[PDB]
Amino acid sequence: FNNSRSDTLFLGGEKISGDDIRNQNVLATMAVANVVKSSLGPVGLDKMLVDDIGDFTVTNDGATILSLLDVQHPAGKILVELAQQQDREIGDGTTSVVIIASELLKRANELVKNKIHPTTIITGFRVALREAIRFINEVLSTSVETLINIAKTSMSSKIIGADSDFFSNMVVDALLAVKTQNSKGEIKYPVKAVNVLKAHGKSATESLLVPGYALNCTVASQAMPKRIAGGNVKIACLDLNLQKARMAMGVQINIDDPEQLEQIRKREAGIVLERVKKIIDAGAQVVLTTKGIDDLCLKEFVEAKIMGVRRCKKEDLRRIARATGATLVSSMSNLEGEETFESSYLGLCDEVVQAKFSDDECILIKGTSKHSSSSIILRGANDYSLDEMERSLHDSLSVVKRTLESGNVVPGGGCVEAALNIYLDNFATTVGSREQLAIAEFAAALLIIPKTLAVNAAKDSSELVAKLRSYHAASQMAKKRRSYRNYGLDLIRGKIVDEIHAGVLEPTISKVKSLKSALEACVAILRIDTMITVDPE
Amino acid sequence: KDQGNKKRQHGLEAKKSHILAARSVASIIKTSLGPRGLDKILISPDGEITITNDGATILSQMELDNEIAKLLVQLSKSQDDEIGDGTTGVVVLASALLDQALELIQKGIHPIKIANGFDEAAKLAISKLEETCDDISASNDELFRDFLLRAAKTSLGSKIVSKDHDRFAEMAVEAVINVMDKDRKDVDFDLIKMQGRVGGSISDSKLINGVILDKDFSHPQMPKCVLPKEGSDGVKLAILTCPFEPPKPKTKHKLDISSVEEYQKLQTYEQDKFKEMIDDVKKAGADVVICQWGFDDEANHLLLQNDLPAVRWVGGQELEHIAISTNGRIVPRFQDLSKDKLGTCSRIYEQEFGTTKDRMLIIEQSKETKTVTCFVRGSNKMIVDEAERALHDSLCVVRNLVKDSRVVYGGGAAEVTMSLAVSEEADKQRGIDQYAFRGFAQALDTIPMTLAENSGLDPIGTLSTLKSKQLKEKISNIGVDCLGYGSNDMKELFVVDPFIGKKQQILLATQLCRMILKIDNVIISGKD
Amino acid sequence: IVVLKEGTDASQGKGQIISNINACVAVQEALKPTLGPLGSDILIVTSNQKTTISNDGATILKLLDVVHPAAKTLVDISRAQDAEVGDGTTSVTILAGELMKEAKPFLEEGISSHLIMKGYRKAVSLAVEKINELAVDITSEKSSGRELLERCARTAMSSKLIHNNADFFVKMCVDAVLSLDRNDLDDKLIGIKKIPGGAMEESLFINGVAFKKTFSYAGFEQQPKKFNNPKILSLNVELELKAEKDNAEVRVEHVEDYQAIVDAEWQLIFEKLRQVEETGANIVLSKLPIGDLATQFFADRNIFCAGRVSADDMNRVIQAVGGSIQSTTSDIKPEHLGTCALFEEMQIGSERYNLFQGCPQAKTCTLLLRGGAEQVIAEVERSLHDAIMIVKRALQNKLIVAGGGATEMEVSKCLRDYSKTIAGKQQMIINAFAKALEVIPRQLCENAGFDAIEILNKLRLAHSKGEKWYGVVFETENIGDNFAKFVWEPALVKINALNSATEATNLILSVDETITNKG
Ligand SMILES: Nc1ncnc2c1ncn2[C@@H]1O[C@H](COP(=O)(O)OP(=O)(O)O)[C@@H](O)[C@H]1O
Ligand SMILES: Nc1ncnc2c1ncn2[C@@H]1O[C@H](COP(=O)(O)OP(=O)(O)O)[C@@H](O)[C@H]1O
Ligand SMILES: Nc1ncnc2c1ncn2[C@@H]1O[C@H](COP(=O)(O)OP(=O)(O)O)[C@@H](O)[C@H]1O
Ligand code: BEF
Ligand code: BEF
Ligand code: BEF
Ligand SMILES: [Mg+2]
Ligand SMILES: [Mg+2]
Ligand SMILES: [Mg+2]
């Protein structure tokens, strides 16, 4: 064993052809997939990934495990970039889009060893998908709480899941409250709002859901108030900085007469000081600049008990302002003047307070005019668990933004897989030929999710996998009696149940893209028959 | 195990490599196939310089690491072993075949299916030749001597020896007649001492009807030559394997000497004991002594006074040829002498050599003994050492002609008759075996073409002529004008190759192919 | 701060079992090409520097070194196959591996290995009986005594470098399994000899016995080199003056005693020497030397000899001319000697070869092999041992099965059909082994090029739908009755194969922790 030599065709690098490379690819994808096949399902578990300094992170987000795990090799990166696509597209389904991909190559490859051209296998998988995508719309349905359910089942393989009921609720709640219309209709749920925060202390359950937003800052000078308004407040969402001006980059102050020295000088303080006044003089009780504040132009807010926060997160102010109806003041101008325009640009908020959280202490803008908004704040044992709590609070809360934007769900629990399996499997004879083996493989291959969903329970999973297999195989006999697919796995107990009833819901939009995608990879790799690796520099 | 330092090859490349490697070994020796051929200076890693048109010898000397070449090394060798003349050619044909085989492969043919194709087309040619060949033994006696020679000659035209090819040929013809019998048809080459020394030119290479050996003739005073001793039946000579020294045990010794008594008897024991031998040989009535092991100062002197020229120390094969040459018996002890076990040779002289202080000796016989000694001479080592192997080549073609009086006319024509016949059967083949047969015959064409290339004739040209002519008339023998002369027709021209060999050759190549092709997997490791 | 093994690797887990499988697969896929009539061949240049080329799967798997515990069993079961049978070596591994391959799905899905082990266990039992059940015993059932050994040594000699010169070698092969007593077939008698050069078929079948030419002494060249009915003296020891070995001390105080003891030495030899002459022999052989003087003597009185004959040779010499080794020269009686039909000293391939050809009373032949390279002669000798050994085990068991995938394909049938009646875990496992057998037909087609998929699938119909000997028409690529086509192999192969192959397969499926020690 071991490929080598060259003889003719002098090439500045490595080059494997046929069997040799074609297997290498399959091995590659295989390994990168197998690392995260033990994180699949509720019975699946997280892992710790230590660096060189010794620090680490524990996480089940397949996409971050494959990101965090240094992968060197095309077909390896491919499935790490494909695991990426998911987390970037829908937001959950990563761990699974890879396990599928690997399974398609691994399998398809076997067919080639049997002497079956790659293309004939490719078209075969292509048709198995056409039929499979269509059929996927024959298990799904319109939203008919499906929400607190979607948000829950998406926390099974996660840390946040021991307290499913709690967060499953806080998730939908928080998201919903932020909805908007983008432009011309839409009604999209902010694919990123709800500033999430975390602080070590108290229970996992004691995670608060602010009734507004959580801007993470103090209050400039400790001299100003730490809590303002009980009834109504005017919030100044700025952007321009209130510090001592410096004039044009090319504006030399050339003095010819010692007179002008002192004058123009102290003027500098006032120029950006007037700007301060024209803002306090608007009813501004709360100021949120983005580009920081002077300590001089701060005392002005202090002397006036105006909660004024320095250099804020501009990604928050943009949302702190849509939430108090205010205006992100780029620079007081309008036509040709200068003012933050009394309450014209200001925002209406119920109350601005600086709540503490042991060690930390941040500001809260809870209750507002047009806010609707929310923001969650995790509390855990330490950063190690906390990063992950959120990590999967997101991989969960994302499943919701898509169930919403796309009113359509399918029963997970490895049901979808089983169904497609037996359907495509029987459908496989509708073309016979060599091509049969293709679709057949495709279908058969899908049973990876149900098998591995269960094997992650130690017990002889050949049980469920067999039952669930049979069921659908039967159900599609008058698919008539009382047709009952939607039968998934209940690993916690070890039996086949109706997941739609049980509460195991997953958005169609996931398993529809998770599938169309994973094959798009498998094919571009199925075509690989020679890998020329140039020598670097 | 040992995963590293271990490479693998398989078809895409592999086959190209091998095929090319063959081809390349070939490209070197192709310029040595022909009576217009050229030799190749090979140098031993120690520093030994050789120069030789001999196929086998060349490819043996090329210290080479390519596995496929290593195979062609033996291919030329094995043939040298079985015949003695193929060498230079067997490889050519083999390579051509491979290139051919390969060519087909890139058109979708199975390597192993080409193999069977070639083996088949081959067997056919072997036959189309086995039928067209001619016979010599069964035709005449004076003409057998001639034909047998007209082969030895043709067999030498591609050698430095060529210069004096008349003599070297008639020498090889003789050397074999004299040690093999028409019935047994067996030439044992132990009965032919191929000894060579330097001096003169290659022309002064004669044949000795006895043997040579190097000896100063025991005692200096001794005569230089040896007459047939007045009216006798030639010369008689002692052939003993017992040392002219006081006999000793072969188990122990310790001849305990109690007193002057016994030491007095030993005294006179060794003394006259030397007379006990010197007398013994005189009694058998001999002229000269040829003892396997040396003699003592005393015993030597006596051999002098008693006119008994002596030969101290003579090797196994040595003493033995002196027997078979002179018709004598190898006598153990001394008392086992006798006028009837002596050697009836015809003369003995101490041969001089330029000014070389060596100066060996010789034993003649006049009448064709059952031992010949081709004594080769040359202006310089290499000329000799080549001329000896050149002589050998012919001597072998003379042996093959008694073991199979069948002859085929070479000049390339012999290979054209196959290419012609084999190609005919191709059209009938059709399908896959059609490509094989075409190939086999096509590779063959390279043999004559190469001759044309070396003699300065347009290859495609001489081939079309050789093919047309050997068809428009009869699937006979029309060869290449390798040297010029009137025209083709190896017959007139007297170009002849023993059939028996030609078959072997056109087999050894196809078979070797048949092996290489079946190789689709390779695994080489290094020298840990 | 303490330890428990001193830095010495050792893996465990479920992956451990999977590693081992795949490991074996490698060593397996390696030989897959050397299968079938149109099978590829290998060229191994071991770290030794000795270059070899062959197909005896055993010989390949022996040159691969291989150190992986698991994958190293495939090397063992391949060796045994070249023992208890002599052929099929290539295949025992293809299957052995293939099963381990089909065990992956279960082992992965999360099934006990003890269950897969059981499943395969029955599968073999059933499959083994099925072969015994088809083992067409014959004798004159339109088969003849020679046409069985021929028809079987032939098909088995196929797919080897020795193929297109088949007829020549099968007629040669059978003739040499018969050369020895059919009551006790001992290979050690068919002693083979290799001669540098010549056509890979210009090989010679000596009727009596042939051996080297150890004749290393002066005075030869005399002694006829050919006799018709000579009186062979299969002597065992010495024939030198001073003796080749052993001694004592001779102490004498008398000058005469010295010359006395000398004359004694001589006479001591000569006597023993004439003692041989007295036996009235023409050929005097000895596993010990025959000194210059000795060989010189016989040379004088036209008696031929040879000293230091190969030990394993004199034994074949006896069995040829029917002599009988003798250690001393004294009690040499005449039923001790031997005589052939013809003796000659050849010059085959530029090497003199003493050979006692023609011996209608022999129980041991010898055969010289030829070739254009020390690799081909070598491959013949191994391509021929695989045949001779199959002819031999076809006398002792006139039970034969038609391979070419048929036997293999059929044993699948009954096994796959059986699994229907079982249902469940054992169903899939036993049904797997059934499919796993398809590797031989499968691979056999890919190697040659035939449509592996269609030819296989087309075979499954017809074979299961009747024709219990349908395999593959090597000729017109298509299925066919290999029994009718005469593709016979003793059942003794397949039965040993599936027994011994599975052994490996469960031996591996049984290991969960491999602890390699370092040092
Ligand atoms: N409550 C459950 N019972 C059975 N299966 C579940 C349940 N919760 C999630 N699943 C299934 O587990 C898989 C998702 O788990 P996970 O390992 O988190 O994949 P991803 O990380 O890709 O979301 C899907 O098959 C989903 O249908
Ligand atoms: N005198 C010649 N005229 C025509 N052909 C000859 C002549 N001499 C040799 N040949 C051709 O060349 C062949 C011999 O080639 P040579 O260079 O001697 O190498 P080798 O004989 O070792 O193959 C002969 O068999 C014949 O085909
Ligand atoms: N003539 C043939 N036609 C079809 N199959 C054959 C033929 N000859 C041998 N076989 C089959 O080829 C396989 C033997 O392969 P081979 O390369 O001979 O290795 P081994 O015999 O050592 O396994 C067996 O299935 C045997 O039945
Ligand atoms: F780990 Be997954 F993406 F929910
Ligand atoms: F050139 Be060859 F050896 F006669
Ligand atoms: F390679 Be097997 F022994 F025929
Ligand atoms: Mg999930
Ligand atoms: Mg020549
Ligand atoms: Mg075989």
* Domains of chain B with bracketed CATH: 1-136+406-527 (1.10.560.10), 137-209+370-405 (3.30.260.10), 210-369 (3.50.7.10)
* Rounded CA separation B272/B490 (Å): 72
* Rounded CA separation B349/B223 (Å): 9
Q: Under an 8 A CB cutoff, do A462 and C425 touch?
A: yes
Other beta carbons within 10 angstroms of residue B116's beta carbon come to: 18
* Rounded CA separation A220/A292 (Å): 9
DSSP secondary structure letters along B395-451? HHHHHHTTS--EEE-TTTHHHHHHHHHHHHHHHHH-SHHHHHHHHHHHHHTHHHHHH
Contacts of B139 (CB under 8 A, 6+ apart): none
Q: In this structure, which amino acid lies at residue A439?
A: I
Q: Is B79 exposed, middle or buried (0-12, 13-18, 19+ CB in 10 A)?
A: buried
Q: Mark which residues 476-515 of B lie under 8 Å from C by CB.
A: 504, 507-508, 511-512, 514-515
For A27, A234, A427, the CA distances from A312, given in Å and listed in that order, are 49, 17, 59
Q: Is B431 exposed, middle or buried (0-12, 13-18, 19+ CB in 10 A)?
A: exposed
Is A61 annotated as catalytic? yes
* Rounded CA separation A499/A173 (Å): 23
Please name which of C414, C401, C411 lies closest in space to residue C481, comparing C-alpha atoms.
C401
For C315, the token pair is 């034994």
In this complex, the residue of A2, A7, A9 whose CB is nearest that of residue B3 is: A2
At C272, give phi and psi (nearest 5°). -50, -35
For B103, the token pair is 């060519």
Contacts of C486 (CB under 8 A, 6+ apart): C151, C155
* Rounded CA separation B111/B305 (Å): 80
For C260, C288, C293, the CA distances from C247, given in Å and listed in that order, are 18, 17, 19
Q: Under an 8 A CB cutoff, do C371 and B78 touch?
A: yes
Longest dimension (CA), chain C: 103
In this complex, the residue of A2, A8, A18 whose CB is nearest that of residue B6 is: A2
Mutate to test the pocket of ligand 3, among C154, C401, C444, C450 (most ligand atoms within 8 A of CB): C444
For B67, the token pair is 């596995």
* Rounded CA separation A375/A199 (Å): 14
At B211, give phi and psi (nearest 5°). -160, 175
Assign residue C377 the CATH number of its domain. 3.50.7.10
| Residues C244 and C283 occupy one common structural domain | yes
| Residues C323 and C184 occupy one common structural domain | no
* Rounded CA separation C310/C236 (Å): 11
Other beta carbons within 10 angstroms of residue C461's beta carbon come to: 12
| Residues C296 and C391 occupy one common structural domain | yes
Contacts of A317 (CB under 8 A, 6+ apart): A215, A237, A238, A239, A288, A290, A328
Residue where the block lists tokens 């601005």: A352
Q: Under an 8 A CB cutoff, do A1 and C453 touch?
A: no
Please name which of C169, C161, C215, C165 lies closest in space to residue C192, comparing C-alpha atoms.
C169
* Rounded CA separation B366/B369 (Å): 8
DSSP A54: S
Q: Under an 8 A CB cutoff, do B6 and A5 touch?
A: no
Residue of B nearest to A4 (CA): B7
Q: Are C234 and C325 in contact (CB under 8 A)?
A: yes
Q: Are B83 and B441 in contact (CB under 8 A)?
A: no
Task: Give me the sheet containing B347-349, strands edge to edge.
Answer: B225-226, B347-349, B362-364
Q: Under an 8 A CB cutoff, do B249 and C218 touch?
A: no
| Residues C324 and C282 occupy one common structural domain | yes
Please name which of A290, A296, A308, A249 lies closest in space to residue A269, comparing C-alpha atoms.
A296
For C222, the token pair is 């005399």
* Rounded CA separation A494/A463 (Å): 9
At C320, give phi and psi (nearest 5°). -100, -60
At B147, give phi and psi (nearest 5°). -55, -45
State CA B96 to chain mean position distance.
Answer: 27
- Which chain A residues are within 8 Å of B17, Cβ to Cβ? 5, 7-8
Experimental method: X-ray
Q: Which chains touch C (3 or more CB pairs under 8 A)?
A: A, B
Hey, is B349 helix, strand or coil? strand
| Residues C144 and C241 occupy one common structural domain | no
Is A8 annotated as catalytic? no
Nearest CA to ligand 4 atom 4: A92
Task: Name the active-site residue from A239, A294, A387, A395.
Answer: A395
Pocket of ligand 3 contains residue C34 by CB under 6 Å: yes
Q: In this structure, which amino acid lies at residue A491?
A: L
For A370, the token pair is 């047009």
Pocket of ligand 3 contains residue C426 by CB under 6 Å: no
Q: Is A20 exposed, middle or buried (0-12, 13-18, 19+ CB in 10 A)?
A: middle
Residues in chain C: 519
* Rounded CA separation B473/B471 (Å): 5
* Rounded CA separation B375/B359 (Å): 14
Contacts of C147 (CB under 8 A, 6+ apart): none
Q: Are B516 and B17 in contact (CB under 8 A)?
A: no
Residue where the block lists tokens 């390349």: B24
For C69, the token pair is 């515990």
CA dihedral B216, B217, B221, B225 (to 10 degrees): -110
DSSP secondary structure letters along C154-221? HHHHTTSTTGGGHHHHHHHHHHHHSSS-TTS--GGGS-EEEEEBS-TT--EEESSEE-------TT-S
At A77, give phi and psi (nearest 5°). -60, -45
For C124, the token pair is 């073999």
Sign of the four-CA dihedral B185, B187, B191, B192: positive
Q: Under an 8 A CB cutoff, do C453 and A115 touch?
A: yes
Q: Give the pairing type, strands A58-59 and A197-198.
A: unpaired
Please name which of B30, B22, B10, B9 lies closest in space to residue B101, comparing C-alpha atoms.
B22
Please name which of A24, A371, A447, A51 lies closest in space to residue A193, comparing C-alpha atoms.
A371
Is B393 annotated as catalytic? yes
For C421, the token pair is 């009646």
* Rounded CA separation A243/A311 (Å): 11
Assign residue C192 the CATH number of its domain. 3.30.260.10
Q: Which residues of C120-136 are buried (b: 16+ CB within 10 A; e: fewer)?
A: bbbbbebbbebbeebbe
* Rounded CA separation B345/C416 (Å): 89
| Residues C284 and C391 occupy one common structural domain | yes
Q: Is C247 exposed, middle or buried (0-12, 13-18, 19+ CB in 10 A)?
A: exposed
Please name which of B118, B115, B96, B117 lies closest in space to residue B22, comparing C-alpha atoms.
B96
* Rounded CA separation B38/B453 (Å): 13
Task: Name the active-site residue from A46, A57, A59, A61.
Answer: A61
For residue C197, give its domain range: 139-206+396-400
Q: E-strand spans in B29-128?
A: 40-43, 49-52
| Residues C199 and C309 occupy one common structural domain | no
For A95, A411, A448, A472, B309, the CA distances from A414, given in Å and listed in that order, are 14, 8, 9, 12, 112
Mutate to test the pocket of ligand 4, among A96, A100, A159, A388 (most ligand atoms within 8 A of CB): A96
* Rounded CA separation B212/B343 (Å): 15
- B118 Cα–ligand 5 center, Å: 25
Pocket of ligand 3 contains residue C440 by CB under 6 Å: yes
Is A327 annotated as catalytic? no
State CA A534 to chain mean position distance.
Answer: 36
Q: Is A465 on the interface with C (CB under 8 A)?
A: yes
| Residues C234 and C351 occupy one common structural domain | yes
At B215, give phi and psi (nearest 5°). -150, 140
Element (H, E) at B78: helix B67-82
For A202, the token pair is 């108290």
Residue where the block lists tokens 């890998």: A531
Residue of A nearest to C444 (CA): A114
Mutate to test the pocket of ligand 4, among A92, A156, A456 (most ligand atoms within 8 A of CB): A92
Other beta carbons within 10 angstroms of residue B386's beta carbon come to: 23
Q: Under an 8 A CB cutoff, do A434 and C453 touch?
A: yes
In this complex, the residue of B191, B324, B518 whose CB is nearest that of residue C41 is: B518
Euclidean distance between the first and final Cα of chain A, in Å? 30
For B340, the token pair is 């009837």
Element (H, E) at B363: strand B362-364
Distance from CA of A8 to the nearest CA of C (A): 20
Q: Under an 8 A CB cutoff, do A115 and C112 touch?
A: no
**CA atoms within 13 A of residue A420's CA, in its CB half-sphere:** 34
- C68 Cα–ligand 3 center, Å: 28
For A515, B389, C108, C371, the CA distances from C365, given in Å and listed in that order, are 71, 38, 56, 20
In order of their start, the domains of chain A are 1-143+408-537 (1.10.560.10), 144-210+372-407 (3.30.260.10), 211-371 (no CATH)
Ligand 4 pocket residues where CB is under 6 Å:
A 60-62, 92-95, 157, 395
For B9, B29, B217, B257, B518, the CA distances from B72, given in Å and listed in that order, are 19, 12, 48, 69, 16
Ligand 1 pocket residues where CB is under 6 Å:
A 39-42, 44, 62, 92-96, 153, 156-157, 412-414, 449, 453, 488-489, 491, 504, 506
- B158 Cα–ligand 5 center, Å: 7
For C55, C76, C96, C495, the CA distances from C500, given in Å and listed in that order, are 20, 10, 8, 9
Q: Where are the alpha helices (DSSP H) in A114-250?
A: 118-136, 146-153, 164-176
| Residues C199 and C303 occupy one common structural domain | no
Residues with CB under 5 A from ligand 7 (ion): A 92, 154
Please name which of B112, B75, B116 lies closest in space to residue B518, comparing C-alpha atoms.
B112
Q: Where are the alpha helices (DSSP H) in A323-373?
A: none
Angstrom resolution of this structure? 3.8
* Rounded CA separation A126/A439 (Å): 8
Contacts of B401 (CB under 8 A, 6+ apart): B136, B147, B148, B151, B407, B498
Which residues are bridge partners to B207 per DSSP?
B374
| Residues C368 and C257 occupy one common structural domain | yes
| Residues C282 and C143 occupy one common structural domain | no
> Where on the phi/psi map is residue A486: left (φ > 0), alpha (ψ -120 to 50), or beta?
left
Please name which of A131, A63, A140 lies closest in space to residue A94, comparing C-alpha atoms.
A63
Q: Are C293 and C271 in contact (CB under 8 A)?
A: no
For A236, A464, B342, the CA distances from B333, given in Å and listed in that order, are 136, 101, 14
| Residues C333 and C225 occupy one common structural domain | yes
For B38, the token pair is 């050229």
Contacts of A103 (CB under 8 A, 6+ apart): A33, A445, A446, A448
- Which chain A residues are within 8 Å of C108, Cβ to Cβ? 451, 455
Residue where the block lists tokens 């003056």: C241
Residue where the block lists tokens 């092969």: C173
Residues in chain B: 528
> Where on the phi/psi map is residue B321: left (φ > 0), alpha (ψ -120 to 50), or beta?
alpha
Please name which of A378, A387, A373 lies closest in space to residue A360, comparing C-alpha atoms.
A378
In this complex, the residue of C110, C442, C451 whose CB is nearest that of residue A462 is: C110
Please name which of B8, A309, B253 lies closest in space to residue A317, comparing C-alpha atoms.
A309
State CA C117 to chain mean position distance.
Answer: 32
- B162 Cα–ligand 8 center, Å: 11
Q: Is B188 on the interface with C (CB under 8 A)?
A: yes
Element (H, E) at B519: strand B519-525
Q: Give the pairing type, strands C352-357 and C209-210.
A: antiparallel
Own/partner pairs for A2-6, CB < 8 Å, 24+ apart? A2/B3, A2/B4, A2/B6, A2/B7, A2/B8, A3/B7, A3/B8, A4/B6, A4/B7, A4/B8, A5/B7, A5/B8, A5/B9, A5/B13, A5/B17, A6/B13
